[PDB]
Design a protein around this ligand. Sequence first.
Ligand SMILES: N=c1c2ncn([C@@H]3O[C@H](COP(=O)(O)OP(=O)(O)OP(=O)(O)O)[C@@H](O)[C@H]3O)c2ncn1[C@@H]1O[C@H](COP(=O)(O)O)[C@@H](O)[C@H]1O
Ligand SMILES: N=c1c2ncn([C@@H]3O[C@H](COP(=O)(O)OP(=O)(O)OP(=O)(O)O)[C@@H](O)[C@H]3O)c2ncn1[C@@H]1O[C@H](COP(=O)(O)O)[C@@H](O)[C@H]1O
Ligand SMILES: [Cl-]
Ligand SMILES: [Zn+2]
Ligand SMILES: [Zn+2]
Ligand SMILES: [Zn+2]
Ligand SMILES: [Zn+2]
Ligand SMILES: [Zn+2]
Lengths: 222, 222
Amino acid sequence: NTRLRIAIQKSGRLSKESIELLSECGVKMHIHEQSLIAFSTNLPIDILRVRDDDIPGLIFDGVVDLGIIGENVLEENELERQSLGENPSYKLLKKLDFGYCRLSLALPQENKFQNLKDFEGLRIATSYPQLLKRFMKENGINYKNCTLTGSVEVAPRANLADAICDLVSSGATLQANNLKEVKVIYESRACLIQKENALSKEKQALVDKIMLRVAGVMQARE
Amino acid sequence: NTRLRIAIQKSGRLSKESIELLSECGVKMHIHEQSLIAFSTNLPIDILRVRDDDIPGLIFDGVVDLGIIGENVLEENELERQSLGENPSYKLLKKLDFGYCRLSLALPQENKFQNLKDFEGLRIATSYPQLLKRFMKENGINYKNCTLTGSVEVAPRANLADAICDLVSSGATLQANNLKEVKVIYESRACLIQKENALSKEKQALVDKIMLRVAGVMQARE
Ligand SMILES: N=c1c2ncn([C@@H]3O[C@H](COP(=O)(O)OP(=O)(O)OP(=O)(O)O)[C@@H](O)[C@H]3O)c2ncn1[C@@H]1O[C@H](COP(=O)(O)O)[C@@H](O)[C@H]1O
Ligand SMILES: N=c1c2ncn([C@@H]3O[C@H](COP(=O)(O)OP(=O)(O)OP(=O)(O)O)[C@@H](O)[C@H]3O)c2ncn1[C@@H]1O[C@H](COP(=O)(O)O)[C@@H](O)[C@H]1O
Ligand SMILES: [Cl-]
Ligand SMILES: [Zn+2]
Ligand SMILES: [Zn+2]
Ligand SMILES: [Zn+2]
Ligand SMILES: [Zn+2]
Ligand SMILES: [Zn+2]
C-alpha cells in the first residue's frame, strides 16, 4: 500500500474533532457511519475508524501510519505492552487542543480524606489498571484492583469498590454519583502519533505537509 | 459484606441464557436497565452486569464470587495475566449448555489453502491475540499480529490483514465477507467459574445449592 493510513476513533468523544481536524488540514473524506474504512477523496490517505483502545496497538504494530488518540489510552496500552515483555514504540507528532481530561482518584463525598495514605488497602475500580498500578507503586500505597471497562463511577454505590480511578473533565458525573475528586494521577489530551519505522520518502513528505497545516490550524483556533 | 456476587454479561450473546439459567435455578431478580447491580429479591445474591471481557479479571482478583463467561474470553485473559508474570486462578464449576462457538483461522475465499504453513508471514487480524499467539507458537508458524476489538471480518477488505482469527458459530458472517474457515484453533462454550479463595460457610452452602439446580436444569434441557 502506498496510501497513508490514519486511525481515528469510530464513535466516541474524539470522533467529531478528529474528523474536523483532518478536514481543516485539507484532507477531504467520504465517511459511512457504521463502517471501518473511510478514505480521502483528494489525497492518497485511508482513514481507519476503530475502537479507540485499539489505536495504540495498531501504531505499535505498524498496521497504520498515524493515529489520533487520548494520551491516557496510549499510556495505558504502552505500559501493558511493556509489562508483557514487549517494546512498544511510537513517535509523538503533536499534542492537540481537544480531548482534555484527567485521570483521578475519587472517593464517596462523605469520606474522610486527609492523605494519599487514606487509600491504603482500599478496593479501587478503574479502566486504567496499569496507570493506577504505576502511580500507587511510585507512592508506596498498597491497594486492591478492580478492572471495569465501563460504569466505573457506579462501583462504589454498588459496593464493588471503596474508591475509583476514572476520567474527569467537567466533574458532573462525579457529582451525580456523590463522589469527590481527591487526587489527579494523570493529565491527558488527544495526540497525534506515528509508527516507529520510517515511512517512504513520499509518505513522510505527505505527513510533513499535514503537520505544517495542523500547526497552522491550531494557531488560528487560539 | 454478606451477599454472594455473581457476574454476568450486561448485554451480548450470553446475557439472556445467563439470566434464564439463574432464574431457573431459583434466583429471582429483576433485570431492567441497572447500570451495574441487580439485587435478588428472594436470596442474598447480587448480580453484577458487566462487559464480558471484565469477568475473568473480576474472578481472578476476587472482586466477585461467581461468573458466567465464554471459555474463549476466560482463556484469553488468563494468558494475558500470565504473560504479565501474574498467577491468575479460578475454580471451574461447570461447563454449560450454551455459548457454543469456535475460534478459527479464516482466509479470503479465492485463496490457496493447502496447509497451516500457508499462514507463514501473514498479517492476521484478531480480538484474541494471546490465543492466536499460543496456537501459532505451538505449531511453529511465524506471523504478524493485528489486534482489533470489532469488525475483524472486515480487516482483509480494508487491507489491514491477510487473514483473520475469529469466532464462528453458523458461518454466515464469514460467508457474507467472502471468507472461508480453514482451521479451528479453539473450541468454546459458556462456563460457570468461582474465585480461588474460599468462601464463607454460608456463601459456599448457597453455591452448593445453586450447583445442584444448575445440574438439574441442564439435564431437563437435554
Ligand atoms: N469526560 C470524559 C472524557 N473527557 C475526555 N475524554 C477522552 O476521550 C477518550 C474517548 O472516550 P470515550 O468514552 O468515547 O471512549 P470509550 O468510553 O472508552 O469508548 P470506545 O471507543 O472504546 O467504544 C478518552 O479515552 C479520553 O482520552 C474523556 N473520556 C471519557 N470521559 C467520561 O465522560 C463522562 C463525563 O465526564 P465529566 O465532565 O467529568 O462528568 C465521565 O464518565 C468521564 O469518565
Ligand atoms: N458467533 C459468535 C458467537 N457464538 C458464541 N459466542 C460466545 O459469546 C460470547 C459473547 O459474545 P459477544 O459478541 O456478545 O461479546 P462482546 O461483543 O465481546 O460483548 P461485550 O464486550 O459488549 O460484553 C463470545 O465471547 C463467545 O464466547 C460468540 N461470540 C461472537 N460471535 C460472533 O457472532 C457473529 C455471527 O456469527 P456467525 O453465526 O458464525 O455468522 C460473528 O461476528 C461471530 O464472530
Ligand atoms: Cl458506497
Ligand atoms: Zn459510501
Ligand atoms: Zn453499509
Ligand atoms: Zn475505549
Ligand atoms: Zn422491577
Ligand atoms: Zn467483549
